[PDB]
Structures are given as structure tokens and as C-alpha cells.
Design a protein around this ligand. Structure first.
Ligand SMILES: CC(=O)N[C@@H]1[C@@H](O)[C@H](O[C@@H]2O[C@H](CO[C@]3(C(=O)O)C[C@H](O)[C@@H](NC(C)=O)[C@H]([C@H](O)[C@H](O)CO)O3)[C@H](O)[C@H](O)[C@H]2O)[C@@H](CO)O[C@H]1O
Ligand SMILES: CC(=O)N[C@@H]1[C@@H](O)[C@H](O[C@@H]2O[C@H](CO[C@]3(C(=O)O)C[C@H](O)[C@@H](NC(C)=O)[C@H]([C@H](O)[C@H](O)CO)O3)[C@H](O)[C@H](O)[C@H]2O)[C@@H](CO)O[C@H]1O
Ligand SMILES: CC(=O)N[C@@H]1[C@@H](O)[C@H](O[C@@H]2O[C@H](CO[C@]3(C(=O)O)C[C@H](O)[C@@H](NC(C)=O)[C@H]([C@H](O)[C@H](O)CO)O3)[C@H](O)[C@H](O)[C@H]2O)[C@@H](CO)O[C@H]1O
Ligand SMILES: *[C@@H]1O[C@H](CO)[C@@H](O)[C@H](O)[C@H]1NC(C)=O
Ligand SMILES: *[C@@H]1O[C@H](CO)[C@@H](O)[C@H](O)[C@H]1NC(C)=O
Ligand SMILES: *[C@@H]1O[C@H](CO)[C@@H](O)[C@H](O)[C@H]1NC(C)=O
Lengths: 320, 175, 172, 175, 322, 320
């Protein structure tokens, strides 16, 4: 007999399940995902002066490995390192290698400056190897010189070379030490004398001795060349004194500015933008969390160990 | 729930109401009808939009690599990095779970409160001219045509206009 | 409190009610009685059970040792580990404190709301046959015997049967 | 808001109420009145004071330096420290933002609840002697002088004293 | 008139909890969230465990007498004890912290023969009173102390090569003896200049015995220091030496993964646990603990807090007391 | 017509904006700051036995650089290091310098104990240098002695010096190795013989060879003195065997207790107290957060990347 007005709310046939403080299976009218599960399988490089190193390892840029010939100098805001990239054509390693790679991958460019080092007539400064091929022939690291005695068996002469940093910014200098595979090889290259290399600046001091020892062949070679580095401050000199075994710098490096270093397997895409990168590519999500990888670089969502986390965007669903 | 309306004294929702979150169904001599309430609907939507604006975002802090993808790491430093990264991941996973659980509880209860606030607005509007049936409806003790129903929905219903008629029908009292 | 019933318009709790969290007491011409309410009690308990299931748990992450108990650590890395561990402890201590404080606030207010929801259910059942006294009781304006009182508790009370009697007593 | 009173059915606040947070205004034959309610005011203030006691504090943990201000640091350890510190900063920035957002929501809604609880206390006191106007006021259907108004504020108002007078006026049957 | 009254339960003695707005809120019931108690024992039920006792992990690789029962094996849990013995002869391992952690993360050790043999002018059976085994002078079981057969004569220029014929990397260890004096150095290896070279495809180093004056450790001024590297599958490692090398007779292979525990608490096989610390085991369902920040396994998170009570009931509003 | 009673709440003319879960600009009656933005430009040292090192570098306290003459011993609960502090008057460096500096800055004092080292008639132990001036005269590190041949050009004698730790706590012993600038210089100071320094304890041993190499002048000097250190355990001996190039300790150090190391440029203020310090001074706030610096020491508010975070201390402000 009385007229009626009824208050109510909407519902949907199929609601979405969310978790609350008191209920693991609460049905609501709608929800939205907060953990990103999808990645773009490209490196989104739009708006970035980027350098893809390909098979060139960052350290190879400083010493001049043949794979790095197109990457000896340049500028960039983003530097991309790839898997199985080549640093050492000749067998060996760099001392304090991880710190050096990190420094290069934090830079925004490299320039090169001549050392001006010269060598007397009894030194062959153009030593080459089958391990470092360039332009169809035996070659060597482009930024270094393999010094040996010109006459086989003769004592390599006592030599002293100085690099002065005439710039207003710090330079990075690298050199190598050759470690022969046998006494006969050592004698042939540098003579029978006791070998010693010393390096000295205002901020750095060290000495090195070529170690002769039997080793397995790596790419047909039992010899090793190990690399060392330091920073030369503005106005300072660094002095090399040596009588056989030094792989001497013909140029030094200057790392310029800052950039973002990326280690990734994903191909580059110049038509899209991103701020967040990982091994598998780019993450362009607006969501606060992601479950792709704990290893990311740039401005990224936080990694969580969750497949899904649904945020309610509606009331409790109470269907008819 | 907290405010007792949604999944409470309101038995169920209306799947047929597609133009709003909250609304009215009426019954009079002319027939039946349905209409959404704009103000309560928008109150709920604006609050959820506010939550989304705050939650759907990342930090602007630029992070760099401390773990080599394609090379070996130092064993001592690598274990410290692994412990730290796993500890940080446990914190963010926990914080994410707590955020969404707390926000979902609040979203559900907020929506419940807006239903109740609409119900309370209508109750006070109708004053002594109607009675609550306990299921979210008001039984109106006077003839209330489509214009009268519209005045209730539009918040322009004047109880004094119908009071004498309503009290006669409710209580059998003449002035 | 938030919903105004527990430690609010309900003056105090009943220590004698041991078979439930919420319930009824009545007084009529025949005598008095007490009974617990199942649905409201179970609603509160189920929500607290849900919190406990969510909270009483540890992470699945397996951690290994980064600090040697019986031997010396490096001084530089040791200080970094000490700083990191203390920073992580401060985060977890803070999060634990906030979690329990927030959950306790919500538990108390949830319990308050279930008291109010029961009160509101009874108010709407009684319709125009009763009036609120402000202390959590309803004064019923018709004779309501033990069977009538049971129908209120059982949610089967039909106001329309008693309405004429109740309105006569309310108005005079 | 959640409880529907503050920025809800109460149209606005009173800038002229400087002796409390909640209170009463009235009108009768004797005059116009205003008075703060001590119990609701102090309930709100005590809860806010409780929050401030918990929030306004630092940890007792003593931290030492792991980054040299005036000298060089090692490259790899320095990168790990930079990653760790920035990760910890992101956690605390997030926790601080969430804390204050959550606490502010609760403070506002708690204040709303105390307003509603005062309103509900008065509604139940007045019983059948008054009617709600929908704006936070009660129209009282008997002569209610200053002592009567004070009894409402004190919770000593006796509805039974005025019930006969009130019902005659409410039903419009006063001889 | 007749009346029906709504109410809620209470208890005479409530429990205090903290809320957002109140540090001393009384509720009907509450439960603890921080674990304060530990079992003073290593709960090893369902674990193929190895208790090393007085054997130090590094001693398993070199074969210190204390480790004779732990030269090989498999395990999912490895327990290290305080004051465990690694070195019988005075000395130390270079990069020892990384090595110990590698062993404590492993699920077992296997041993593979190097096949190192020596000519008639080498005495490969050098022993010391510092390393006693079966009531007699002995040496590290996995290594050999090479000296000149004839006292004072030059130790011959010698080459030894280990090939990794396995599909997994092997851990090779060797020592360098540093004599107490020039006369002792001359007696063992001759007057010649000494040099030990070690070279693989991935590793290169050279060593020289030093004879500088140093104090006696249990009556011996000599030192034997240990060095190690990983030999990759299919690679070989060549030792070129003329006196001073302590050469490996076996190499090690670390197998799988396991949980390393450092504790003085006794083993208990009747109970299980996933969380351990110095003082024993933590078997709790609770999310937090205040026993130690140094834990291993699947653990509750450490908090600097004695108690955190979680409310499991409403506000307690008891009846009036006179 | 009827009498009326109205329920209400207060408001203010000037409300404060805060952020909630649902609203970025919610106006409330009052609010208070949770992030401290201000710092005192002073080091608040009330209630602290502190040492301001000034021009003295922590390592200089152990070796006795002239700048550190008033900081050779002492006790403190707080040690303050300043920018451009001097450790090495003579050109050189300390091996494992970072760990040593941190040990000193974590300590609550230094005690010095005599080594008791004596030298025969063919050693001059009073070597000095213009690099380490005291009162206008050539001097040397206070805690060490530069040993040279008494007769110029003669072979420095084969010498032994032994320090025994007679204490119940470990002692920190330092020594130097001189690296001459030329062969002529090396010959004049130590003779033409091959130089060798060995150091041996129960827990430590090492050997050192002075290196003669060309290197740039630092304050007019191409020579270098590099420092090395170890801990001598209670009851143990440490033996120095040397024939030229050792810079020998006249005292050893004992680090006492613990203390708070501060690196800052701010002046001392003994009137006020603080538990939290940074480069720019002290943070005496009661607030939980701060935006001054992520690098702080002591008991501090947590660093956050936010200018302001206002906590509501009142209801929604709804003006008339
Ligand atoms: C060409 C030469 O100088 N000597 C002849 C040897 O090459 C040859 O022994 C073979 O040497 C092979 C490696 O050859 C190079 C290389 O790396 O390609 C040749 C380079 O010209 C030489 N470079 C320099 C600056 O000396 C380089 C170098 O000596 C080593 O890398 C140092 O470790 O070696 C390879 O090792 C073969 O296994 C080996 O047989 C001998 C014997 O035929 O004759 C030499 O005249
Ligand atoms: C000729 C004479 O009168 N010599 C007196 C010695 O009795 C004594 O010299 C000490 O002798 C020590 C011998 O101990 C061993 C050991 O470590 O147990 C014996 C081992 O067979 C020997 N092993 C090998 C492979 O040579 C081992 C080894 O030489 C050293 O450990 C190498 O450092 O020594 C030991 O050689 C002491 O270094 C040596 O001082 C001394 C009293 O100390 O008086 C001599 O006059
Ligand atoms: C033995 C001596 O004192 N000879 C004097 C020469 O050194 C000096 O030649 C000038 O020497 C300058 C550096 O002089 C000192 C120094 O560092 O101040 C002088 C110290 O007495 C000496 N100390 C010791 C213990 O030998 C010290 C030391 O030899 C070197 O630092 C070791 O590297 O050198 C500077 O090099 C000038 O360039 C040089 O001309 C002349 C006087 O001018 O003769 C001697 O008096
Ligand atoms: C760190 O974690 C990675 C990924 O699980 C693992 O491969 C590596 O072995 C760990 N590092 C160390 C030093 O154990
Ligand atoms: C760490 O951050 C500081 C401050 O931005 C910077 O000076 C330094 O270069 C960073 N460390 C490394 C190793 O890059
Ligand atoms: C109200 O309370 C005040 C203060 O206790 C008292 O003085 C006054 O008489 C009371 N009035 C009524 C009507 O209850």
C-alpha cells in the first residue's frame, strides 16, 4: 500500500578476487595489477646518444683490441655492453679489471691523447701477433706497443719514458707486462739480463717483473700479457723505466662526463623511449613493482617476489 | 562489513545498474524505475582515482649496476651483494603485500561508507513521512509520483508538503 | 571509538557472557535472560583468524652467512656489513611496530563495528514498536514474552503483528 | 567522508568556536547559545597526541661512517655502498610517505567519527521530543529553556518530562 | 516497558597492546609476534648433516690430521665449530675467507688423484712433528713435502702437470715452504735461487721461498702458506719448480649446495628446523625474532624489540570494581 | 517556530594542506612537519670529551707528522677529522690505508709504547729532511727513525731489531721503506750492496726491497717513504732484519676503547649537545626524518628524498 524507494549499489556477474587484511579471497567488482610481468624485448634508445659496443668489451676501447677499432673515441649518454665481448686478443687479463670496466661504463665518452714515447734503434717497437689480426695481417693492440730487441738474444736497452698530463682533467693510462712461456723465449725477446719495470708518478708507484713459466696454450699461445692502469692527475708526470717486458702506451685515455651503462642481450629500437633496462630489454611500465629481474639499471619499479598483486578499484561484488 | 550496508543490510547489488555505482529503485502508482546517484558514485570514484595516482608510480632515483651480467664477480663482495639484494627484495615484497592488502580493505570499507551516507541522506530527507524496511528501502506513506521520486533523488524533497497525509497513514492521527 | 558502541554508548562489557562475543539481555513481565549472538561473534572471529593467517608467517628466502662467527672479517667490508645489517634491522623493527599498531587499531574498530551492526539490525527489526534508551537497549512498547524475545534474537520478529498495540502505547 | 558528518551533512565548521573542537549551538526564547563539548574534543586531541608520541622519534641505533668525506674510496665497494644507501633511502622515503598518508586519512576519519558519536548521543537523548533537520540540528518540539539546553549538553536531559508536550506539537493535536 | 539490551563480553584482567593512538590499550586477548626463545641445540632431523668437530673446513681440502674422517663425503648441512684446526704446521692460506665460504656453501667433497710423481733425487716423503698421525711424524694427507734426497744438493728443476679430465671445475691447492734460515733452506733445497711457477689457461702466479728471521710457533720458525685456484674442465695446470713447492697429491671437487652453520650447540636428530644461529635453532611460526641478527636458513626477521602483542579481541571494558 | 539545538565542529581561517591516501591536497585545521630541513652549522660537543685534529690526519697521529705533534696520544669519545689534513710530510703513502684510518676513527684514544730499538756505531739513526720541518729545522716523523750509513757510501750493516709485546692487549706497529730517487743516492745512504728488509712475527711476515726509479718531485723530492703496519699480539715478538732502507719505529701504538669518528668542516661549539652529525654540522631535531644528507653519523633521523611531509594534527577544515 505505501509507495517505495529502495537504495542500492551495482554488481557484476564475474567479479575479481583480491586479498585484504582479513580475507585472502575477497571478490570485488574490479581490480588492477600492481606488479609488472611484461617487458619490451628491445633496448628503447629514442632520445639517447647511445653506443652499441657489439663484440667490443669496454676495456678493449682503452687498449685498442681489433674488435674495438670503431670505438676508440666517441661521446655517448648510454653505453651498451654485450655478452662474450672481446677485450684481450692476446691471452691475459687486467689487474683491478672490475673497477676499470665500471669506470668506463659510467662515462659519457672517451678521447685519446698521444704519449709521445720513442725508442732507440736496437728496439723493435712494432711487435705483432697472430692472436690480434687487423686488415688481413698480424697486428697488436692499437693503443700500445710491444717492444722487443731488434737483434734476437741481445739485451733490451735500459729505457725511460715520461707522460705529462698537460690537460686540466685527469687521464687514464694503461700498460702491459709480457710474461714469456720459457727462458729461451724470454732470452730471444729481451736478452739474458734480469728484467724489471718500474712506474712512478706523484700519486702512484709500482714495480713489475716478467715471470717465465710453463703454461697451456690459449689460442696457440703460452705467453701472457697482463694489463695495469692508474689515473694521471692534471699537471703530473708518470715515468716508466724498463729493460724488457713492458707493453708501452702510445696513447692515454680521458673519460668524459657521465652516462648509463647497460649490459643486455636485447636488440636496439630507436623508435621508442625508456628509463629502465635489464638483461632482456626495457621496462616502460607505470606500475610500482615488477617481477622480471632484481638486476635492473636506470629509474625502475622495485623488484618483488610475486607473480601478481591485484589492487581493488571497486566495491565488494555481491551478485544477484 | 565495517559500515553494514554493502554485503550487509543491502541483500545484494544490482547487475542491471550500469550507469553508476549507487542508485535508486522506486515503486509507485505509475510503475517502477531505476536511476543512478551522481554525487555518491563520483565520491567513491574520485577517492579510488586518488589512490591510483599515489600508488601507480616509481621512484626517480637512478640506479647503476653492481652485478656483472656477463662476467665473474668477487666471492666475498658477491655474497654481500646477494645478501643485501635478497634482504631488499624481502622488504619490498612485504611492503607491496601490506600496501595492497591495507588499501583493498580501505577501498571496500570506503565504498560501504558511501552507500550508507546516501541511505542516511535519504532517511533524514524523508523525516516522518517514511519508514525503513531493514533491507535498504523506505516505505513512503503518501502518494509519491515520478516528480516526487525525482525530488527525493535530486535532494529537493520537502517533507512538510506531505507530512499531514503521511502521519494520517502511519499513525491514524488527524490534526 | 570509531563506531561509538564498545567503550561508547555501551557502558561496559558483560563478564558473565562466556559463550559469545556479542549478545542479548532482556527484561519482561515474566523475568530476565541472557543469550549470545552467533553471527556477529563469528563475523568478528573470522576476521581476526584471517589476520593471524596473513601475519603469522615468515619469508621463503634462504639466507647464508656473510659474517664469520669464529674468525676475523675484513675491516672495510665488515663495516659495510655492520651498516647494512643495522639499517635493515631498523627497517624491520619499524615495519613490525607499524604493522601491529595498525592491525590492533583495525581489530578494535572492526569489533566495535560488529557490535553496532548487530544493534542496527535489531533497531530495523523492531521498526516503530520500540525506542532506543541510548545505553544499547530498546524499550519495547508491547508485551514481549520469552517467545517474542527469542524471535528478536532469531531475526524472525515481525513488527506488523504488534504495531497497532505498540503505537497505542507509544502515543498515550 | 567515512562517517558522513564533517564535510558531510554538517555544512561547515564554526570559526567562532575557539574553546573546543566539537560543540553545540542553540536557539530558544531566552537567547542564542554556543558551547564546546569537552568529552569529544579531548577524545580527538588525546588520539592525535598518541600518534605524535609514536611518530615524532628516531631510532637509538648508532651508525658510523662507511663513506669518506675528504678522501678517495675504492671503486667497487663505493658502488655497492652507493647502491645500498640509495636503496635504503628509497625504502624510508616510501615508508615516510605511506605513514603520513595513512595517518592523515585516519586522523581525518577519526575526527569525523567523534562528531558523529556526539550527534548520535544527542539524537538518542532527545528520543521522541525532537526531529533531525538533516543539517546536524534537532528541532525540539517543546519549550526548551537554558537549563533544558544545558541538560542536553550534560547528558541529564529527561525526555519523559517533556514527552506529552512534544508529541502534541509533533502530531499537531495541541488543544 | 519490556526491554532488550545489546552488549559484548569482557574479562576481569585484560591484555595491554599498542595501537596507532594508544600505547596502553587494554583488549580481551592478544598474542605474541616476536619470538624470544631458542632451542639450545642444532635440530638436524631430515638433514644429511656433517658435524666437523675440531676439523676446520679448509683442513678437509689439504688433509690435516684432525680432518681424516672428513676428506670426502656428501651432506646438505655442514656444521663448523669454534677453535677448529686447519693448519698443523705454522702458516696460513691466501684468500682464506673466500675458500672457507665456498666449502661451507657446498653439498659435499670428492677427491681426484693428481698423478704427480718425482725422480730419484727428490724425497717426496717429507714429514714434521707438527703434523702427527697415528703416533708418528706425518704431513697434510693431500699434499707432499718435496725436498732434496741428498742434504745440501740443489733440488732438480721439475715439472708436474694436472689435467682436469672431468666435466666440472676442480679446486687445486698447493703450499710454499718458507724456511727458518739460509742454512735450513740450503739443507732442503740447495744454494740455488728458488722459483715456483704455476700456470693454467685461467691462472698464473710465481712464488719464492723467504728465509727472513721470525719467531717460533710451537718451536718452529718455518711457515707453509697455501694457495688455491679453480681448474676448469679440460684445462691443465703446470707446476714448474726447483725447491719450496708443497705439491698436491689430490685435488678437490665441491659437489652441489648445502647450508653452512657456525655454532657450539650440540646436535639433536629428534627435531627439525629451517633456521639456525650461534646459540642453536629457532623453530617458530612467528614473523619476527629478537635472538640474533646473525641467522642462516629460512628465518623470522630480526627486530630490536622485546615484545609486540597482536590483539586477538575487542577493547576490554570490565565491570566496575569498588 | 520550534527551539533548536545544532551540533558542529570548529574551523580556522587559514588551514594547512596535507596528503592522504585518497587526496593530494586535503585542507586540515593544523599540521606539523615530519622532515627536518634545517641544520646547525656547528659541531655540538657538550657532554663529549672530543679531539679536533685540525690540520692533523689520523694516520699522522701514529707516525708523528709535525702537524700531529699535539695529537700523538690522548683519550676521547669523539674524534673530528678535517678536510686537507696532513698525514705524510715526506712523499709517500700507507699500504692498507683505508682500514688503518677507520680503526683510528673508531677508537677512543691512543697510547704510545717505546720499542726500545738501539743501533750500532755504523748506523746514523738521526736522518732528517726538509719535507718534515719543525721550528724552522729539518726533522722527521716523531715515532720513527730514518737509519742511514754513518760513513757515506759504505754498506749499511746487516742489522736486527726485535720488539716484544709485553702488554695484555695487541699493539699496532708501523714502519716505513725508503725508495731512493737515484742509484747515486741509494749508494750514498746504504752502500752498493743489494738491499732487503724482512719483517716477521708469529702472525705476520713480509719482505721489502727498496726500488730505485725515476719519478716526479713532490715538494722537490723524488724519493718516497711507504708505510706498512701490522698488529703484534700479546706476548709475541716482531723481528726486523735489514741492511738499508728501513724507517724503523721508536714507538708502537695501542688503540683504546671506542669512539665516534666525525668528518666535518663545521666549527666546535661546547655550549650545545647533539647525537647526530654530518659534513655541514649537527642535527638536533626530534623529527623522525631529515633531508639534509644521506651521509650522517651517530643516532640520526632517517634520510628521505622529500622537501616536506606534513602530518595532520586536526580535522578537515571546512570554512564559512
Ligand atoms: C716469428 C718469430 O718471432 N719467431 C718464430 C716463432 O713464432 C716460432 O714459434 C712459434 O711461435 C708461435 C707464436 O708466434 C708469435 C705470435 O704470437 O704470433 C709470432 C710473433 O711475431 C711474436 N711476436 C713478438 C713481438 O715476438 C710472438 C711472441 O714471440 C710470443 O707470443 C711471445 O710469447 O709469437 C706459437 O707460439 C707457436 O706455438 C710456436 O711454434 C719459432 C719456431 O718455429 O720460430 C721463430 O723464429
Ligand atoms: C744439527 C743440530 O744440532 N741441529 C739442532 C736441531 O735439533 C734444531 O733444529 C731445528 O730442527 C727442527 C726439526 O724438526 C722438523 C719438524 O718440523 O718436525 C723435522 C722434520 O723432519 C723436518 N722436515 C723436513 C721435510 O725437512 C722439518 C723441517 O726441516 C722444518 O720444519 C723446516 O722449517 O723440521 C726444525 O728443522 C727447526 O726449524 C730447526 O730449528 C735446533 C733447535 O731448534 O738446534 C740445532 O742446533
Ligand atoms: C746526505 C745529504 O744530506 N746530502 C745533501 C744533499 O741531499 C743535498 O742535495 C739536495 O738534496 C735535497 C734533499 O735533501 C735531503 C732532504 O730530504 O731534505 C737532505 C736530508 O739530509 C737527506 N736525509 C737523509 C737521511 O739522507 C735527504 C735524503 O737523502 C733524500 O730525501 C732521500 O731521497 O735529502 C734535494 O734532493 C735537492 O734536489 C738536492 O740538490 C746537497 C746540498 O744541496 O748536499 C748535501 O748537503
Ligand atoms: C649470488 O647469486 C647468484 C644468483 O643466484 C649466484 O649465481 C651466485 O653464485 C651468488 N654469489 C656467490 C658469491 O655465491
Ligand atoms: C658514489 O656517489 C658519490 C656521490 O654522488 C660519487 O661522488 C661517487 O663517484 C660514487 N661512487 C662511485 C664509486 O662511483
Ligand atoms: C550541567 O553541568 C554543570 C557543571 O557540572 C552544572 O553546574 C549544571 O548545574 C548542570 N546543569 C544541568 C541542567 O544538568
Amino acid at each position: 500500500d505505501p509507495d517505495k524507494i529502495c537504495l542500492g549499489h551495482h554488481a557484476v556477474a564475474n567479479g575479481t578476487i583480491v586479498k585484504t587484511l582479513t580475507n585472502e579471497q575477497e571478490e570485488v567488482t574490479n581490480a588492477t595489477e600492481t606488479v609488472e610481468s611484461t617487458s619490451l624485448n628491445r633496448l628503447c634508445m629514442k632520445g639517447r646518444n647511445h653506443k652499441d659496443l657489439g663484440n667490443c668489451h669496454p676495456i678493449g676501447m682503452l687498449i685498442g683490441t681489433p674488435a674495438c677499432d670503431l670505438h676508440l673515441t666517441g661521446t655517448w649518454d648510454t653505453l651498451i655492453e654485450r655478452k662474450n665481448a672481446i677485450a684481450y686478443c692476446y691471452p691475459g687479463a687486467t689487474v683491478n679489471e672490475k673497477a676499470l670496466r665500471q669506470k668506463i661504463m659510467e662515462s659519457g665518452g672517451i678521447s685519446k691523447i698521444n704519449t709521445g714515447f720513442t725508442y732507440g734503434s736496437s728496439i723493435n717497437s712494432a711487435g705483432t701477433t697472430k692472436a690480434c689480426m687487423r686488415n688481413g695481417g698480424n697486428s697488436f693492440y692499437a693503443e700500445l706497443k710491444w717492444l722487443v730487441s731488434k737483434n734476437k738474444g741481445q739485451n733490451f736497452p735500459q729505457t725511460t719514458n715520461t707522460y705529462r698530463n698537460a690537460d686540466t682533467a685527469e687521464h687514464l693510462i694503461m700498460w702491459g707486462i709480457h710474461h714469456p712461456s720459457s727462458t729461451q723465449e724470454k732470452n730471444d725477446l729481451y736478452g739474458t739480463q734480469s728484467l724489471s719495470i718500474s712506474v712512478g708518478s706523484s700519486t702512484y708507484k709500482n714495480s713489475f717483473v716478467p715471470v717465465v713459466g710453463a703454461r697451456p696454450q690459449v689460442n696457440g699461445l703460452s705467453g701472457r700479457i697482463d694489463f695495469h692502469w692508474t689515473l694521471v692527475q692534471p699537471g703530473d708526470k708518470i715515468i716508466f723505466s724498463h729493460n724488457g717486458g713492458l707493453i708501452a702506451p702510445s696513447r692515454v685515455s680521458k673519460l668524459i662526463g657521465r652516462g648509463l651503462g647497460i649490459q643486455s642481450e636485447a636488440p636496439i629500437d630507436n623508435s621508442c623511449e625508456s628509463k629502465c633496462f635489464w638483461r632482456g630489454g626495457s621496462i616502460n611500465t607505470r606500475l610500482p613493482f615488477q617481477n622480471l629481474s632484481p638486476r635492473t639499471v636506470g629509474q625502475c619499479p622495485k623488484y618483488v617476489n610475486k607473480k601478481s598483486l591485484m589492487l581493488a578499484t571497486g566495491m565488494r561484488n555481491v551478485p544477484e | 562489513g565495517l559500515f553494514g550496508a554493502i554485503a550487509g543490510f543491502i541483500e545484494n547489488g544490482w547487475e542491471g545498474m550500469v550507469d553508476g555505482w549507487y542508485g535508486f529503485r522506486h515503486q509507485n502508482a505509475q510503475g517502477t524505475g531505476q536511476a543512478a546517484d551522481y554525487k555518491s558514485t563520483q565520491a567513491a570514484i574520485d577517492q579510488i582515482t586518488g589512490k591510483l595516482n599515489r600508488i601507480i608510480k616509481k621512484t626517480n632515483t637512478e640506479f647503476e649496476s653492481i652485478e656483472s651480467e656477463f662476467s665473474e664477480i668477487d666471492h666475498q663482495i658477491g655474497n654481500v651483494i646477494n645478501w643485501t639484494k635478497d634482504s631488499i627484495t624481502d622488504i619490498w615484497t612485504y611492503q607491496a603485500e601490506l600496501l595492497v592488502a591495507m588499501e583493498n580493505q580501505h577501498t571496500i570499507d570506503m565504498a560501504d561508507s558511501e552507500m550508507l551516507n546516501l541511505y542516511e541522506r535519504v532517511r533524514k530527507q524523508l523525516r516522518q513521512n517514511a519508514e525503513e524496511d531493514g533491507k535498504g528501502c523506505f516505505e513512503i506513506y503518501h502518494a509519491c509520483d515520478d516528480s516526487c521520486m525525482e525530488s527525493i533523488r535530486n535532494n529537493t524533497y520537502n517533507h512538510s508538503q506531505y507530512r499531514e497525509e503521511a502521519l494520517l497513514n502511519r499513525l491514524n492521527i488527524n490534526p
